[PDB]
From a paper:
Hydrogen sulfide (H2S) plays roles in many physiological processes in mammals, including relaxation of vascular smooth muscles, regulation of inflammation, and inhibition of insulin signaling. More recently, it has been proposed that sulfane sulfurs, i.e., sulfur atoms with oxidation state 0 or −1, existing in the form of polysulfides (H2Sn), glutathione persulfide (GSSH), glutathione trisulfide (GSSSG), cysteine persulfide (CysSSH) and so on, actually mediate some of the reported biological activities previously thought to be regulated by H2S67891011. We determined the crystal structures of the m3MST complexes with 1 and 3 at high resolution. The most remarkable feature is that C248 is persulfurated in both crystal structures.
Interestingly, 1–3 all have a similar structural scaffold, i.e., an aromatic ring-carbonyl-S-pyrimidone structure. Persulfurated C248 appears to interact with the 4-pyrimidone-like aromatic ring of both compounds. To our knowledge, this interaction is novel in terms of both the long distance (>3.45 Å) and the orientation of the persulfide bond (almost perpendicular to the aromatic ring of the inhibitors). Direct hydrogen bonding by R188 and S250 and water-mediated hydrogen bonding by E195 and R197 are commonly observed with compounds 1 and 3. In addition, compound 1 forms water-mediated hydrogen bonds with D63 and H74. Both compounds were in van der Waals contact with W36, L38, P39, D73, H74, Y108, R188, P196, R197, G249, S250, V252 and V277. The thiophene ring (compound 1) and naphthalene ring (compound 3) exhibit cation-π interaction with R197 and parallel stacking interaction with the salt bridge between D73 and R19726. Gas-phase calculations indicated that the interaction of S–S− with pyrimidone is strongly exothermic (10.4 kcal/mol; CCSD(T)/aug-cc-pVDZ), which is not inconsistent with the experimental ITC measurements (ΔH = −9.37 and −11.76 kcal/mol for compounds 1 and 3, respectively). We concluded that the interaction is predominantly due to electrostatic attraction between the persulfur anion and the positively charged carbonyl carbon of the pyrimidone structure. Compound 1 showed about 25% inhibition of recombinant CBS and CSE enzymatic activities, while compound 3 was almost inactive towards CBS and CSE.
Numbering used by the authors: 5 to 22, 27 to 296
């Protein structure tokens, strides 16, 4: 029914030695982490990989963060990294969590009509742990022909989130850390304060991942949604800070057989900026 979302390190390592495969490092870190993803790629990466810069695949005209680009922009960029319609794209990142920003890129390719895409389970962390082969040097690829076309069903807008406060057609699940959702930990963006969307439920993205940074099983993921009173038989929308880690909610749903979980791309940054005071639920004190 669905093209597989996960591939293993061992399957990738074997495939390297043997529908072309394109490995993409989509690492991206918030400034306060003090890490530079592209610099790290140049030092060490999976052999043959290219670096997918999520800042080259976003709408910089927006005041909000990590917003989808238009289809032409995406297509041009994917093609420049050597992706074609026949390609099996496998995305990874080098996060401490295992996967962090890579699931956004999996979701983006699918939203743009490219369904033969997967994530490297455990990311570069696991790859390194296993002492698998690595390469260095700046990113490069020959170009390929790529077309894209956005399926709007992959997205919810601010207007949709606001209407749903009353209509209650879909469940909203927020992948931010618990303290950000509750209002007790800061938002990384200056001018944005923490808290959550009324009626939403928190499943921090780390809840989908084991202690080794691998994805939990579909069985454990279904249990996790059920315990949080999230019903995979009803409509579900994923949100987070800027629409990136929300994709872990989409992924865990997809692995559970529910492949139609849109992302609220605007996410908390947009919600906060466009809010009236009643729209911010927080243990913290509302802005004066
Ligand atoms: N360039 C940026 O988006 C940026 C720079 C400083 S703060 C920031 N972005 C944000 O604070 C958006 S909220 C946010 N974005 C993320 C992006 C990638 C991965 C995780 C997150 C997150 O938890 N929250
Ligand atoms: Na976004
Ligand atoms: Na580079
Ligand atoms: Na802030």
């Amino acid at each position: 029914q669905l093209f597989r979302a996960l591939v293993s390190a061992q399957w990738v390592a074997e495939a390297l030695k043997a529908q072309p495969l394109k490995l993409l490092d989509a690492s991206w870190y918030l400034p306060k982490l003090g890490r530079d993803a592209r610099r790290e790629f140049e030092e060490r990466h999976i052999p043959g990989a290219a670096f997918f810069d999520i800042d080259r695949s976003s709408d910089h005209t927006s005041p909000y963060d990590h917003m989808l680009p238009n289809a032409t922009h995406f297509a041009d960029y994917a093609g420049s990294l050597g992706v074609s319609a026949a390609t099996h794209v496998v995305i990874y990142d080098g996060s401490d969590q295992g996967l962090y920003s890579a699931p956004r890129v999996w979701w983006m390719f699918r939203a743009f009509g490219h369904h033969s895409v997967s994530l490297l389970d455990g990311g570069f962390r696991h790859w390194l742990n296993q002492n698998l082969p690595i390469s260095s040097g700046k990113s490069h690829s020959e170009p390929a022909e790529f077309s894209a076309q956005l399926d709007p069903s992959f997205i919810k807008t601010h207007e949709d989130i606001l209407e749903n406060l009353d209509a209650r057609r879909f469940q909203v699940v927020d992948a931010r850390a618990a303290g950000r959702f509750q209002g007790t930990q800061p938002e990384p963006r200056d001018g944005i304060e923490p808290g959550h969307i009324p009626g939403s439920v928190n499943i921090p993205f780390t809840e989908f991942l084991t202690n080794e940074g691998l994805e939990k099983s579909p069985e454990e993921i279904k249990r996790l949604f059920k315990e949080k009173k999230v019903d995979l038989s009803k409509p579900l929308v994923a949100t987070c800070g800027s629409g990136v880690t929300a994709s872990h909610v989409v992924l865990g749903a997809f692995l559970s057989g529910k492949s139609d979980v849109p992302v609220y791309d605007g996410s908390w940054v947009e919600w906060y900026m466009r809010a009236q005071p009643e729209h911010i639920i927080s243990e913290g004190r509302g802005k004066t």
